[PDB]
Amino acid sequence: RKKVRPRLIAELARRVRALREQRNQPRDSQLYALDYETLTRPHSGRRLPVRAWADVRRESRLLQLLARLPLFGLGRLVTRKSWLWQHDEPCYWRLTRVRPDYTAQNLDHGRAWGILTFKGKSEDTAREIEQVMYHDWRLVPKHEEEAFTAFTAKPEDRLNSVPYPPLLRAMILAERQKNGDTSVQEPLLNLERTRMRPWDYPAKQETKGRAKGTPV
Amino acid sequence: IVRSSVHAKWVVGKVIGTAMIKTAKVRATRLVLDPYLLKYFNKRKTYFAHDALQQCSVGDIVLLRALPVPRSKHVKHELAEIIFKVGRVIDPVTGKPCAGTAYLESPLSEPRE
Amino acid sequence: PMKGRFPIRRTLQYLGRGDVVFKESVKIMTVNYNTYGELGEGARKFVFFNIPQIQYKNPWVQIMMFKNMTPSPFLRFYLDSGEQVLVDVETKSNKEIMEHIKKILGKKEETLREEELEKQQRFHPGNFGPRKYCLRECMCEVEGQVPCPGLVPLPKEMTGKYKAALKAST
Amino acid sequence: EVKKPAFMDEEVQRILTKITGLDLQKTFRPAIQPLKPPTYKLMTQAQLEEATRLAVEAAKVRLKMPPVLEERKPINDVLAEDKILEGTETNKYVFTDISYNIPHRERFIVVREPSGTLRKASWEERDRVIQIYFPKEGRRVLPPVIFKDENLKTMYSQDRHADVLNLCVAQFEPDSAEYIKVHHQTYEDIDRHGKYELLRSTRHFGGMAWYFVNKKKIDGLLIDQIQRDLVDDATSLVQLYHMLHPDGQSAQEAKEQAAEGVDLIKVFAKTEAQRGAYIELALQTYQEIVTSHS
Amino acid sequence: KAYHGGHLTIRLALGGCTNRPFYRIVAAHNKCPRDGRFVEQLGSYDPLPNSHGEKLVALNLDRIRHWIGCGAHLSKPMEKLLGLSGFFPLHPMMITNAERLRRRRAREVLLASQKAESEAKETEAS
Amino acid sequence: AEFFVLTERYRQYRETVRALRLEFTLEVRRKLHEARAGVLAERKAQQAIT
RNA sequence: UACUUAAAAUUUAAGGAGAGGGUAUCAAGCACAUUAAAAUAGCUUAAGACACCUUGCCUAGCCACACCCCCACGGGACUCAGCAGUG
Ligand code: FES
Ligand SMILES: [K+]
Ligand SMILES: [Mg+2]
Ligand SMILES: [Mg+2]
Ligand SMILES: [Mg+2]
Ligand SMILES: [Mg+2]
Ligand SMILES: [Mg+2]
Ligand SMILES: [Mg+2]
């Protein structure tokens, strides 16, 4: 070969483009700004889904609650209106770290960290909180923490083993007879190893994407 | 001690040049089937080999071992062995010096020199 | 008339008659033979008749031949471990040479059959697709199944053109 | 209990192989198929005899008898009855496991009916779908029309019984009712018309003689073997009849008289032969011809 | 094409002619065309009843288990086929759709009975 | 009434299917290990050397 | 998709047993080598280098292209080589 010539401009463009992105990164106060009259984000002109309109006008964002508290509410408990309606058992975050967006003129946008207690079961380590820019958060009062966080676990009643599908059960029993294993035991699937979290369970904010800085 | 990627882990060839420092240019030949004629001909390839001791001479048959990491752009083999030295061949079967199809030292004798 | 002596050597059937399939260890086979002499006649016949057959079945093995370098002919195999297997073929017929190398460094018939079956594992007769890869392109070819509309027109009630007319009529 | 002899018992196969016979000209009769130019080799008398031996070895493999089995039992097993799916489908689904390395009699072929019952495929469904996904040269997905009684009678008139059976082996399974029906119909027509020679030196002779022995109607085959001077075969047939019916009057009579050779056939005539009078007449005439001429 | 991202999936690739559909069950990278490059063919589906009135599904259950063990997703039509066979449980929407059909036929039967009762009133009027 | 019944059907269906995907995931790895380092694998390797 | 550690699908980078269009009136290319005290003067090529011309190929499909400037920071003559349609 050896006629594949070098492409200096292409290499220059890639680097130059990447550099500009780092320099002109947007902030939470800009990406997540909202126009409440039209419920449309100015940065991208994305209109929020219809099912979110009522809460955007009726509920507060997390750092709107925390900006009014000393130390940005470190140690306080915060729950979500969606959890309160969906789950009877206590669901909340125990705040541990909070990085407000200083650029915001009301310090109403930022990031937070805490320890999750979902449906009465508590995680062992603190991680970043997702959906901090949602209009769904409710600060728990200090005097009501004891009654709010009181939970008694019920004995688990979800089945631990189930039958095999009709064809897959016949193929298992047939193999037994072929191999000489004589038994009338019913093949049973074990569901303990593979139990699914609820669909609304908090997800990992650290591995989540962030929107780009090109305005629409 | 992972081995080389190159297909030619072991190649035999003739030292066709030795003018580079510590490197011997070796010409290997393989048999390739002509599809039209269905006859085998000799396809020859050049291999640069690391001759650490500069113990190679033009015309001698040598064995090359693929280096684990390519030493340079073209040097990807080393000199494993000199199968036949040019003009100084030693018969493998009997072990006696030979000069062509003849014995410089008779196999009946036991010089042990 | 096909050119050369013994033109049968240049036929695919002759090349495929070779029976020496070397083990994966074998990498090189140097052939040292003499063009003149009486004790090297079998070696000369081995280079003439057998070296083509060996190369055909072992395309990745380097066969390099040297002439009139030693008093007697021999074969030396170079293995991947670094071992060198020297064979002395003087006073030996070309057929005897082939049998000797087959025994010491040749794959057994059992091993070769196993490799053949493994190669075809992913071909299934039931699979449908192009003729290059499959027996039947479509299920219409099978007997008892609905035939291809091109060969046999489908019933009117099985046609989208007809069904659309009814939906409009409804 | 003394085991009932089987078709594949080494003793039965010996007798059945012997009475069948061998004829290299009939076993290797030229096939009406696409032809190639013949090849020629110069051979000595030693080499020629070696080649005839190899031909006889191949003729043995060619004459290997096809299995004689009992009729399979209908498959009627319900894996599940999901009534939620009742009325949601109009046509049956047939699901076939087509993993290559499963014996065909160990594959799972299920049917989801419109009612919702998940059941195992019947024998007819099993054979049909295995032909669709593992096609066998000679077999057709749908049963051919040559096996109808009118069409089969046509083949019998042309003395094509060995083909009717060669076709029945390519199409049907040995344990199927269709297989047994066609074979038992061919064997019965040979009997009535005494066409036993058609299946000699063929793989179908053993099953025919087996069928006659089990059905206690070897009389015709004995009369035919005797008239063709094959009286060593006839004696072996009476031994096979005395082996599969040990408690029969004929088998007990041969033990009392320690009969052997031609005596065994005479014992059969008096005791258990449906047409004993003819067996003796043919046997007597054979002895007269053999004695008179030699 | 040189895909970036995606996962292996088991899906139905449509073949046949116009008004004569036929499917090949295949394992293929999800970004590939419906009838294009695939990894393995895992069976076939003939959705038209044959002479015996049977829709014929072929499943290579040995290879299907292999690719589900390696992360292969399943298309919703393929999940329905595996449920009908008995190899998988019946899909939630197979059950719901069967229930919706039952409630819809009950209404039709009731309406026909009401119409017959209305027709009976017409008979009473004479 | 139908949304809740269907939501639970999906949860139980997806749990059963996750248990089967795990069982299939183990058969793949068992078969692979037997081929790579099974009894038969080791014997043939030494038999060749001998 | 699994585990706190492993099975796949799909790619990328460095390579090479062998194979791979035309013109030899394209016969020389001109740094195209090795060593690793920094010296040696080498490397490719009639077994076809180099130069030029033509062409999608490897066909369950693959490769390249996406208004133009091979690229696309930039600049410019500023977008249907998506479906239908027009000059
Ligand atoms: S090719 Fe099968 S339906 Fe036309
Ligand atoms: K371009
Ligand atoms: Mg969500
Ligand atoms: Mg000119
Ligand atoms: Mg461009
Ligand atoms: Mg254009
Ligand atoms: Mg465009
Ligand atoms: Mg267009």
Side-chain angles (χ1 to χ4, degrees), chain B:
Chain B
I1 298 169
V2 296
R3 290 169 65 77
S4 65
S5 71
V6 300
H7 307 289
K9 305 286 198 289
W10 294 103
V11 62
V12 172
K14 187 177 80 176
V15 170
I16 55 161
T18 65
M20 305 179 279
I21 284 166
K22 291 187 185 75
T23 300
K25 193 161 64 188
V26 165
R27 170 184 287 159
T29 74
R30 296 180 185 83
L31 291 172
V32 184
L33 183 79
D34 185 295
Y36 177 61
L37 301 178
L38 293 179
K39 172 176 188 296
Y40 282 95
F41 294 85
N42 280 313
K43 157 75 173 49
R44 57 199 203 177
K45 195 151 182 171
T46 292
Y47 290 97
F48 292 6
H50 187 57
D51 196 24
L53 307 182
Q54 282 175 121
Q55 66 196 114
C56 279
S57 286
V58 177
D60 58 10
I61 309 312
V62 297
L63 183 69
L64 315 178
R65 188 196 298 100
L67 281 169
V69 181
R71 185 153 183 148
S72 63
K73 181 175 176 192
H74 297 291
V75 181
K76 312 197 178 189
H77 287 73
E78 58 191 334
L79 175 74
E81 170 172 305
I82 294 170
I83 299 152
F84 301 123
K85 190 71 187 179
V86 62
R88 281 155 288 181
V89 176
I90 307 292
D91 184 13
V93 167
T94 71
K96 298 309 193 188
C98 62
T101 64
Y103 299 92
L104 290 179
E105 288 188 1
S106 180
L108 299 186
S109 66
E110 184 64 14
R112 281 173 170 186
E113 304 185 37

Side-chain angles (χ1 to χ4, degrees), chain A residues 6-201:
Chain A
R7 286 187 176 181
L8 302 186
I9 301 173
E11 288 183 44
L12 169 68
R14 185 202 305 181
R15 292 179 291 186
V16 164
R17 285 200 312 276
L19 291 181
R20 294 167 177 181
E21 291 177 14
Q22 295 299 321
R23 301 209 81 82
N24 290 337
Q25 272 294 326
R27 309 303 302 274
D28 295 26
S29 50
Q30 310 172 34
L31 278 170
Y32 308 118
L34 192 72
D35 175 26
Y36 291 85
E37 295 190 48
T38 59
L39 298 178
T40 301
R41 290 216 188 276
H43 188 88
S44 55
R46 114 74 127 189
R47 193 181 198 81
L48 303 191
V50 174
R51 286 182 177 168
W53 289 357
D55 290 7
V56 167
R57 302 202 177 103
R58 202 172 152 86
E59 298 295 337
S60 306
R61 301 192 309 280
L62 180 57
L63 275 87
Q64 281 187 326
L65 301 167
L66 302 183
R68 313 196 300 270
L69 308 170
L71 304 172
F72 288 91
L74 288 189
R76 300 292 306 276
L77 300 186
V78 292
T79 187
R80 297 183 68 183
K81 162 269 179 193
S82 63
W83 299 343
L84 291 169
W85 282 20
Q86 183 58 22
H87 301 307
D88 297 340
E89 308 89 349
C91 307
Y92 55 93
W93 284 91
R94 184 178 306 275
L95 291 158
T96 61
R97 176 155 54 94
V98 175
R99 272 168 58 186
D101 188 21
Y102 50 83
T103 62
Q105 191 274 325
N106 296 350
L107 303 191
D108 54 337
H109 292 93
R111 300 160 65 180
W113 288 262
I115 300 159
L116 181 69
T117 303
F118 197 83
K119 287 180 77 178
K121 306 182 178 182
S122 185
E123 295 190 329
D124 307 325
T125 190
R127 54 195 193 88
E128 197 179 338
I129 309 177
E130 67 157 13
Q131 304 192 354
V132 174
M133 66 291 298
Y134 276 51
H135 300 92
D136 204 32
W137 299 91
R138 282 190 195 175
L139 177 67
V140 178
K142 298 176 187 177
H143 63 107
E144 296 277 338
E145 277 174 358
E146 308 305 305
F148 175 73
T149 60
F151 177 66
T152 307
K154 300 175 181 178
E156 186 161 271
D157 308 289
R158 49 174 53 173
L159 283 165
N160 287 14
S161 74
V162 292
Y164 270 90
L167 180 62
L168 191 51
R169 172 184 170 280
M171 293 195 297
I172 291 159
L173 293 174
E175 181 174 9
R176 279 187 198 171
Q177 186 176 3
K178 181 177 183 178
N179 296 348
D181 181 12
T182 307
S183 174
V184 294
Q185 286 298 286
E186 297 290 335
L188 281 168
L189 271 159
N190 170 247
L191 302 176
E192 298 179 68
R193 291 173 287 173
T194 47
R195 200 74 80 174
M196 305 197 302
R197 293 264 185 74
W199 77 75
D200 52 303
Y201 194 89

Side-chain angles (χ1 to χ4, degrees), chain F residues 5-50:
Chain F
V5 173
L6 177 69
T7 299
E8 300 295 289
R9 277 170 183 166
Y10 261 109
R11 184 186 48 77
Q12 292 171 292
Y13 172 83
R14 286 178 177 175
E15 283 168 7
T16 310
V17 171
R18 275 197 70 182
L20 290 160
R21 170 180 302 274
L22 187 57
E23 295 291 342
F24 299 162
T25 298
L26 292 176
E27 295 176 351
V28 169
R29 299 191 189 195
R30 279 201 297 278
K31 285 170 160 68
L32 194 70
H33 290 324
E34 292 157 14
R36 192 195 316 277
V39 168
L40 297 174
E42 293 180 7
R43 300 192 309 170
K44 289 187 77 185
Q46 278 295 321
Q47 175 183 348
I49 294 155
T50 303

